[PDB]
Amino acid sequence: ERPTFYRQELNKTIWEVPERYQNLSPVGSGAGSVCAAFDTKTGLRVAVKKLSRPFQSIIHAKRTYRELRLLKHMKHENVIGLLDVFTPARSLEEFNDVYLVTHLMGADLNNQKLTDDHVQFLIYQILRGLKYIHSADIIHRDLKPSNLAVNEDCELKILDVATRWYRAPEIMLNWMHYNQTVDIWSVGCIMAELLTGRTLFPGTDHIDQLKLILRLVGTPGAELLKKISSESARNYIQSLTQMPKMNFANVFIGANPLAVDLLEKMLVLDSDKRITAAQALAHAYFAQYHDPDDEPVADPYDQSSESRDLLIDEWKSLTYDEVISFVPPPLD
Ligand SMILES: CCCCCCCCO[C@@H]1O[C@H](CO)[C@@H](O)[C@H](O)[C@H]1O
């Protein structure tokens, strides 16, 4: 049955939401607008995002669909999920607005070294979430402290200048064919910063970022240089003065040797040689948290919906179908 909706003017528009969602109050970007609310059915504080111009163009429509589909797929403790999605529309013909409801997250990992035991717990949770995302054949591509939410029990969820500080070197070289370990590079950068209280590679601009990375991990070795299809890349690298990888033990002074060992395995230039999320969860650094019985994988996720060129009304109809078919997660 259809919930009774009410209407209220918020962020220059009339929002129309199920009455279960009370005390709406703005907090949000625009890069759709977000309101905080209290969900009375579940007892939870939530974020309610009214999408802005979701079907204004083919590009907007395809974006909306892909975003909804992703959020509907993600069902893991360490990944943001969808609590609800709704529209006031009673039919496709009347369908214009989409609203997404998620847990209201109070803090992120930006929000001043952490202790080694806390770094262990936070990075464990990131990697547990990443194992799940990667198992769906999804690459996050923009892992950074602001995309990591934590609650007051230090339970963590991976979220949905934009800073370059956490970005894998191959993304900044426009390499394409990205591996999932682009995300492992980011996790390394985050872990280093939690341990030291300092940004590992605080690049001022695009080339400076690359310069800082090369300073720590050294210039490419022969095995990596063999895999560079680009003639221009190859000839530039060969001309750099050969520098060895720095000693992470004497870069992360005071740090748990198990942590340094893990960082050495994450922050490798060659993406094929970086540790995977599932391998990292088995690393002795996480001995106190690691449990193979509860590090679950995802169902396969279909991203083909993505190479396709469809009409606006087709993307719109497909999005409508996803809104109607939505099943809320268990009351928990
Ligand atoms: C001057 C800085 C050079 C940075 C080298 C980064 C190499 C990243 O690693 C590479 O990434 C690709 C994308 O997955 C793969 O196709 C390769 O097999 C791999 O070597």
Side-chain angles (χ1 to χ4, degrees), residues 169-170 173 175-179 210 214 220 224 227 237 269-272 274:
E170 61 269 32
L173 294 176
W175 207 285
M176 260 100 254
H177 283 110
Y178 300 122
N179 117 273
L210 291 161
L214 286 175
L224 173 51
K227 292 193 297 195
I237 293 160
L269 223 54
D270 192 345
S271 72
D272 300 316
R274 291 177 200 146

Side-chain angles (χ1 to χ4, degrees), residues 50-69 85-89 91-100 310-323:
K50 181 171 185 194
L51 291 192
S52 62
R53 309 167 178 292
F55 309 116
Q56 171 170 308
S57 76
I58 286 155
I59 304 90
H60 291 244
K62 184 170 181 178
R63 183 186 291 134
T64 292
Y65 176 70
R66 162 186 189 260
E67 181 194 6
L68 182 53
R69 274 202 101 233
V85 55
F86 62 86
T87 183
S91 62
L92 179 51
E93 284 104 325
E94 205 199 325
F95 182 46
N96 296 301
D97 283 326
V98 181
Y99 298 77
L100 307 174
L310 304 185
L311 302 170
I312 275 182
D313 282 358
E314 293 176 311
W315 291 120
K316 189 157 114 151
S317 185
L318 287 165
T319 300
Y320 187 70
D321 293 342
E322 295 283 344
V323 174

Side-chain angles (χ1 to χ4, degrees), residues 139-143 163-164 166-186 206 209-210 213 269 271 274:
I139 306 188
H140 187 293
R141 305 185 166 79
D142 201 16
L143 281 178
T163 253
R164 281 165 309 236
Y166 306 88
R167 282 208 217 284
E170 61 269 32
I171 302 175
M172 288 188 310
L173 294 176
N174 204 37
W175 207 285
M176 260 100 254
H177 283 110
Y178 300 122
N179 117 273
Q180 63 193 34
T181 60
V182 302
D183 293 330
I184 293 298
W185 180 275
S186 310
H206 205 272
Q209 188 68 31
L210 291 161
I213 288 161
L269 223 54
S271 72
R274 291 177 200 146

Side-chain angles (χ1 to χ4, degrees), residues 111-330:
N111 302 356
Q112 62 133 159
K113 336 215 288 199
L114 309 193
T115 67
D116 187 67
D117 295 328
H118 204 53
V119 174
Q120 284 173 41
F121 184 48
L122 290 171
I123 305 301
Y124 175 74
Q125 290 184 86
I126 301 174
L127 289 167
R128 185 174 175 266
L130 272 195
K131 177 183 173 189
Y132 176 93
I133 295 165
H134 287 175
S135 70
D137 196 30
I138 295 161
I139 306 188
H140 187 293
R141 305 185 166 79
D142 201 16
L143 281 178
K144 59 191 176 177
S146 67
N147 275 336
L148 298 168
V150 289
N151 72 9
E152 179 136 303
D153 282 304
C154 304
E155 295 171 340
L156 180 149
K157 293 195 201 291
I158 296 169
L159 318 171
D160 250 47
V161 317
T163 253
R164 281 165 309 236
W165 295 348
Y166 306 88
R167 282 208 217 284
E170 61 269 32
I171 302 175
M172 288 188 310
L173 294 176
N174 204 37
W175 207 285
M176 260 100 254
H177 283 110
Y178 300 122
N179 117 273
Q180 63 193 34
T181 60
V182 302
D183 293 330
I184 293 298
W185 180 275
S186 310
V187 177
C189 293
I190 294 163
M191 178 170 165
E193 179 166 355
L194 297 180
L195 279 167
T196 62
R198 84 201 305 92
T199 305
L200 182 58
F201 304 124
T204 53
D205 68 10
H206 205 272
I207 275 285
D208 188 60
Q209 188 68 31
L210 291 161
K211 170 188 287 168
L212 295 184
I213 288 161
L214 286 175
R215 283 172 111 278
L216 179 71
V217 302
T219 51
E223 174 159 3
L224 173 51
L225 280 162
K226 290 165 120 43
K227 292 193 297 195
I228 292 171
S229 67
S230 185
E231 167 206 333
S232 66
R234 175 191 325 130
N235 300 320
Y236 180 89
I237 293 160
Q238 315 219 47
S239 72
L240 289 171
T241 104
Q242 210 83 148
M243 294 297 221
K245 139 175 165 186
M246 282 178 14
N247 188 174
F248 282 32
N250 325 304
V251 174
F252 304 94
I253 291 302
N256 183 340
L258 284 185
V260 176
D261 187 65
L262 184 60
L263 292 162
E264 282 170 315
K265 289 185 174 141
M266 295 178 159
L267 296 166
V268 189
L269 223 54
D270 192 345
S271 72
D272 300 316
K273 300 221 179 143
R274 291 177 200 146
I275 196 171
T276 66
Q279 289 161 179
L281 290 169
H283 187 283
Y285 192 56
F286 305 116
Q288 86 192 293
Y289 297 114
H290 174 47
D291 182 10
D293 300 325
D294 194 16
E295 286 165 2
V297 296
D299 291 337
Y301 180 65
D302 177 2
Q303 281 159 99
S304 62
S305 2
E306 214 103 311
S307 67
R308 289 201 274 271
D309 302 309
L310 304 185
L311 302 170
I312 275 182
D313 282 358
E314 293 176 311
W315 291 120
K316 189 157 114 151
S317 185
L318 287 165
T319 300
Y320 187 70
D321 293 342
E322 295 283 344
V323 174
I324 292 290
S325 65
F326 177 72
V327 191

Side-chain angles (χ1 to χ4, degrees), residues 11 15 25-30 32-36 46-50 100 104:
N11 290 358
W15 287 42
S25 198
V27 326
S29 278
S33 244
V34 180
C35 276
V46 298
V48 183
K49 178 183 183 190
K50 181 171 185 194
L100 307 174
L104 181 77

